[PDB]
Amino acid sequence: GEAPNQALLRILKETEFKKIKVLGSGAFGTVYKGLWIPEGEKVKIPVAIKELREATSPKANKEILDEAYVMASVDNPHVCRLLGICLTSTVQLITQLMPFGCLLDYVREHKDNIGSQYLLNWCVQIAKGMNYLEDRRLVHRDLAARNVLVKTPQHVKITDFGLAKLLGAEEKEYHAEGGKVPIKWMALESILHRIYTHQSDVWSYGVTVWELMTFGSKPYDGIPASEISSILEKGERLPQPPICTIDVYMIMVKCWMIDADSRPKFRELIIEFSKMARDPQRYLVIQGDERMHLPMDEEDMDDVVDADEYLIP
Ligand SMILES: C#Cc1c(-c2cnc3ccccc3c2)c2c(N)ncnc2n1[C@]12CC[C@](NC(=O)c3cncnc3)(CC1)C2
Ligand SMILES: [Cl-]
C-alpha cells in the first residue's frame, strides 16, 4: 500500500510560549497570538495557537489530532504547517502567525486599495498550494477565502485541514459520512452523492476566486442551502463579477462544470493565472488600478510561462 508518513510531530513545552493575546473566538474555538522561544536557541517566533471552546471532550481531541496529523505532514510555501502541539487538557495546535488574518476579511477591508496584480497573484498561489495537496493525495474539502491566510499581501497560504481526507493509493474518490458542511462551496456530486475528489476541490477553488473578484461577497446571498443543489441542477451558477473579463469568468465557469474530469486541473490553473498575472489590466478591470498601494520575444509573450509555474505531476 501507501508510503510511510515520516513527518515529525514536535511536542512543545508550555513554558516556551509568551505574550499570549486573543485574536478571535466562537465557531472555530479560540485563536491566540503569541511568541515561541525554543529552549536553547536565541530566537523568538511569532505564532498562532488554536484550541476548542474551553471544554475537555474526548470526541473533540480526536478531531483536533486528526487536523494535527495532516497539518504536520505538509511542507509547501502556500500551505500552513504545524510547528507543534502543546498537551494541555484540550490539545493546543501551534502554527505560524499570519499577521494580516484571513483573506476574506482582507479583501473586505481593502476593496478600494486592491489591484488586479494582487488578485491574480493570490489565485496563482492558492492554485500552487492546492496542486501540492493533490501531489500528496490530499483532498482538502473546505477550500474558501475564509481558509486562506495572509502572511503578507504578497504571500498567502491555505489552512484548515479539519475536513481533509486522503484519496487512496489505488483509489480515485472518497465517500463521506455525517457532519456539518459548507454547501455553497461544494461541487454538485459532493452535495448529491458525497463524492470528493481533487476535482471537487477545483469547484471550490472556482467559488473562492469568485469571492476574491467580488471583494468578499457571499455566494448565493439570500438563497438557503437546501435549494442550492436544485439551482445547480437547473444549470444556474454564480454571476460574472463586475471586474472580470470573460477570460477570468470562463475559468470560473469551467471549475463549475457537471462532468468533474472536464474541470481544469490545479496545474493548469497555475499556468493560466500566471499568464494573466504578466498583463493584469488585460484580465481584470478595476477603477483606479494605477493608484493602488498596500503594505523580439514580444510576439511569443502571450503564452510565456516561467519554468517554476510549469509543474509536472
Ligand atoms: C481561524 C483562524 C486564524 C488562524 C489559524 C488558522 N488555522 C489554524 C490551524 C491550526 C493552528 C492554528 C491556526 C490558526 C490564524 C493565524 N495562523 N494567524 C493569524 N490569524 C489567524 N486566524 C484568524 C483568527 C481571527 C482572525 N481575524 C480577525 O478576527 C480580525 C482581525 N482584524 C480585524 N478584525 C477581525 C480571522 C482568522 C485571524
Ligand atoms: Cl483551462
Side-chain angles (χ1 to χ4, degrees):
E2 177 76 303
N5 182 354
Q6 306 177 68
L8 303 190
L9 187 65
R10 190 168 180 168
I11 291 167
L12 308 177
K13 302 110 208 186
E14 199 172 36
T15 60
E16 302 182 316
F17 301 113
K18 280 156 191 183
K19 298 207 176 192
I20 294 160
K21 195 219 180 197
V22 183
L23 295 176
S25 37
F28 49 71
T30 314
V31 182
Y32 303 82
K33 96 186 186 184
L35 293 172
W36 174 41
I37 299 83
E39 284 210 315
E41 301 175 68
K42 191 182 174 185
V43 302
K44 302 193 185 172
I45 297 158
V47 293
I49 309 162
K50 189 184 193 174
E51 197 183 14
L52 296 172
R53 292 185 77 170
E54 301 188 315
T56 325
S57 171
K59 295 168 189 172
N61 290 307
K62 158 63 182 182
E63 305 216 320
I64 296 157
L65 292 162
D66 282 340
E67 191 167 318
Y69 180 94
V70 180
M71 205 169 169
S73 309
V74 294
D75 185 32
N76 185 264
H78 307 293
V79 177
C80 288
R81 183 175 51 88
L82 194 80
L83 298 172
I85 58 168
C86 195
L87 302 181
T88 62
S89 196
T90 303
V91 179
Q92 312 204 288
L93 308 179
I94 296 92
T95 199
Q96 172 180 27
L97 185 64
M98 302 295 268
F100 297 87
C102 82
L103 187 53
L104 184 55
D105 297 335
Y106 189 86
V107 302
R108 284 174 179 172
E109 308 342 314
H110 302 95
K111 309 206 182 181
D112 307 314
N113 269 304
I114 292 155
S116 53
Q117 189 66 93
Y118 279 81
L119 289 161
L120 299 160
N121 281 4
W122 296 334
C123 297
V124 170
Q125 289 181 15
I126 295 156
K128 284 179 172 191
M130 291 307 291
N131 177 249
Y132 168 82
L133 297 183
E134 170 167 7
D135 292 344
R136 307 292 277 96
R137 306 171 192 74
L138 280 165
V139 181
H140 194 288
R141 306 199 301 145
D142 199 9
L143 180 54
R146 66 181 177 271
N147 297 334
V148 173
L149 304 178
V150 186
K151 180 187 175 185
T152 65
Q154 299 85 35
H155 194 160
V156 304
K157 303 190 191 201
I158 300 154
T159 199
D160 200 336
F161 295 96
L163 294 166
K165 295 291 181 179
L166 199 137
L167 191 113
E170 290 151 302
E171 300 173 53
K172 303 185 180 176
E173 301 192 352
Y174 171 70
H175 195 271
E177 217 82 313
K180 273 195 170 185
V181 283
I183 298 298
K184 292 167 168 187
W185 286 258
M186 284 162 71
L188 186 61
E189 80 278 10
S190 305
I191 296 166
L192 305 186
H193 306 98
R194 302 161 174 170
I195 299 172
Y196 288 95
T197 54
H198 303 306
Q199 302 302 295
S200 58
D201 280 345
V202 171
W203 185 295
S204 302
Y205 178 91
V207 181
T208 309
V209 173
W210 187 92
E211 290 179 90
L212 300 181
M213 299 314 172
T214 63
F215 299 103
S217 301
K218 300 179 189 182
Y220 319 98
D221 196 9
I223 295 155
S226 53
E227 290 199 301
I228 293 289
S229 101
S230 200
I231 286 164
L232 299 168
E233 276 168 295
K234 290 169 182 184
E236 186 176 333
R237 296 293 186 278
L238 293 158
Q240 184 162 348
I243 71 171
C244 286
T245 58
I246 186 160
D247 296 80
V248 175
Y249 186 57
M250 190 75 72
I251 296 157
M252 299 182 206
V253 169
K254 283 170 173 180
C255 299
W256 311 325
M257 303 257 72
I258 294 285
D259 178 43
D261 299 321
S262 288
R263 296 166 201 159
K265 296 206 174 185
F266 285 118
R267 72 172 300 285
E268 297 164 338
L269 295 164
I270 293 160
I271 291 160
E272 224 56 26
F273 282 98
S274 160
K275 286 174 181 187
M276 292 183 181
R278 294 190 291 91
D279 192 9
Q281 300 190 345
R282 182 177 175 183
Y283 299 108
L284 299 172
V285 183
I286 289 158
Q287 287 201 70
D289 208 345
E290 67 165 35
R291 297 168 290 174
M292 293 292 179
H293 293 273
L294 298 173
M296 190 163 79
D297 294 50
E298 197 159 41
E299 71 190 314
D300 305 308
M301 269 185 188
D302 284 298
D303 301 319
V304 172
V305 183
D306 188 272
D308 295 338
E309 282 73 65
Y310 185 73
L311 273 65
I312 299 157

